[PDB]
Amino acid sequence: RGWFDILDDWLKRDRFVFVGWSGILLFPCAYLALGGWLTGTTFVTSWYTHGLASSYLEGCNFLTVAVSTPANSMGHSLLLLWGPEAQGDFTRWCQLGGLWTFIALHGAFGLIGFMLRQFEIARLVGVRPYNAIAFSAPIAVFVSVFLIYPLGQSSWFFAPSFGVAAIFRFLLFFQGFHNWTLNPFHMMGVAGVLGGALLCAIHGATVENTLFQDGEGASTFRAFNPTQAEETYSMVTANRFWSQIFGIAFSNKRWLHFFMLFVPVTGLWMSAIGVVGLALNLRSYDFISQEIRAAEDPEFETFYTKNLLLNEGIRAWMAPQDQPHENFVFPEEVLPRGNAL
Amino acid sequence: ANLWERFCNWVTSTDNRLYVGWFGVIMIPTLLAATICFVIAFIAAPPVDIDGIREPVSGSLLYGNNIITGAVVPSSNAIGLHFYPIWEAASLDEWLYNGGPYQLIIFHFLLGASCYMGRQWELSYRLGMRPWICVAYSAPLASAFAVFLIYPIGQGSFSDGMPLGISGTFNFMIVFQAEHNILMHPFHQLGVAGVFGGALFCAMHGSLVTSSLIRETTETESANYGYKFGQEEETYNIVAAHGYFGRLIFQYASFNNSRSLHFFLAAWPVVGVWFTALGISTMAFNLNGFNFNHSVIDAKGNVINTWADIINRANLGMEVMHERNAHNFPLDLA
Amino acid sequence: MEPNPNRQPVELNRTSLYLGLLLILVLALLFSSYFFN
Amino acid sequence: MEVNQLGLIATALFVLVPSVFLIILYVQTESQQ
């Protein structure tokens, strides 16, 4: 009955927004990540780090604003406000890209916060901690992409910038430089995300079209009561439908719902692994056997060679403006271009 | 004992291990044709002059592809949107050179998939179910129509439809970005939200139900054996799961009506994927993604680049390189 | 000396066999191209 | 095509070893019953 237990008592009171011990970490960090993003996209430029406008104040819209990465010359500096780069000056901190590390790092500890909260509430309410386990996939994606990837590269500059169009540029960078669509770890991720959305739709649609008539209304939502014992739709009829339509069906409700956890979580973990490889430029860029043949045989052509020509175009046409610290000057005559275009 | 009525009874029988039905009477042959031709062409078809410029692209395994690079190659740009069945070629050799198999496969497949959707309606009626599972399937079905038929119709050529291969797919999506800026198109953004959200809610729902399973088992057995096929009692505790999720967020952001919940699960990805299929279908008529190229300039008139202008540099490099021998004139107008 | 009390039977049902063979075959199909390279 | 000669055995073992592991477990499950 000492202070620790009294504070525990209070953090765990049942209220509109539960706090918990995890809330101490979560709520500051989430609110600051989110405030940093809103603040930067409304007011802060990327002129000195990127040569880019990036705030509403500068004339950008919701698709083009971003909190952009620090200049390449910052390396992996934590860029603390009080550190030797900004030397405590808030304005220069904003201009050097300090809000990017601010958001990334508060964001990471908020994500930890959030998963601890799923653990904390799961334990108080008396349920198994699988929602927390599942959220490990979002964390793996975040750390591998926003932290591990730029740490293997030259600087935070090549991390994703927090913005809609900026993330589009990151997509296209990865195509042109890493040939990431060719990476089987991305392919397993694609299968897990698209497999998840399929499973989400097909499971909802099935439950809704094997409902038991449990009321008299044309709106079938009323005829459910969350404390009823009985299943609200027929697993037997659902199983027959799919067996006859598709060949096989689920027959075990538990396996079904576990598989819905399994499929998208595993896919995200796989894509995180491949990004860890790309941190090192360990790309699935080429097939050697294809290159040997094509080098010797100019009539040999596949969709694989056609896509590398596109990559080579992406690199040369975007690198000067996307990597300004490098001072790339490509005279017109050196740009790869097909006929006419 | 009537012969036609017996056959009708077998077509529509709910006792067949796979339902046939009237939609299946069309689906079965069209899908078998498309499958048999696809497998043969993936393994052994010779190179196809997809872009009409007598520059044939090798798609099959025996001509130096692997699983990742292989493809049934779209039909020649010289053909455009003309119908090119086998019997319109002077020989199979010609038909293979010009990409005939692609037409055979996609027409048969689109027909068979359309009937697949109807077959989903039909058996639901024979089983006394509600009918709208097929409506869920119309989202993936509309997406295949968009990339195999609609986009070709608007651009004028089945040579710009989606190759039937893994690297071919990526080629189609890179070129789409250069010609339409699909990423800056809000219907593709809703598609990403439909697919990301669908995976989110898949995991959420699976994890919440798995989290509230009722102890029916020991630690030496799979919990899945706590549910027996066709038992009447629910196997988890939705109130414990609602009470966990309502506290993780707040109460009124959590479902305790399982019907509303599963409808939400159905509707979110289906609607997102409707929109992204509609995105491809409308970029077929060149209503493209937002263009903010040089939208920010300074007091003097200098262009002030944004992340959209950087996207545009990437789009340019795709544009100038794609189909590198195929353009004689300065605008790629289709 | 008593025989060990902690031994247990192990099981794999037929559906788990199908699921696992499918997983392996599809993984092989995906990765084989990168092994041949 | 000039492919990595060891790709064959990598792929053969990649398929065979984990499959054989599952078949072993399935068959001895059936003989329990």
Binding site: - | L61, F229 | S33 | -
Partner: peptide, 30 residues
Amino acid sequence: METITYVFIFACIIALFFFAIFFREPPRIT
């Protein structure tokens, strides 16, 4: 050799489909 391998795996997947469908554990009620 690589063509044979690719086709062999695909063929095994089709055979598996056949057994998965027609030689499944039959779902039994209650």
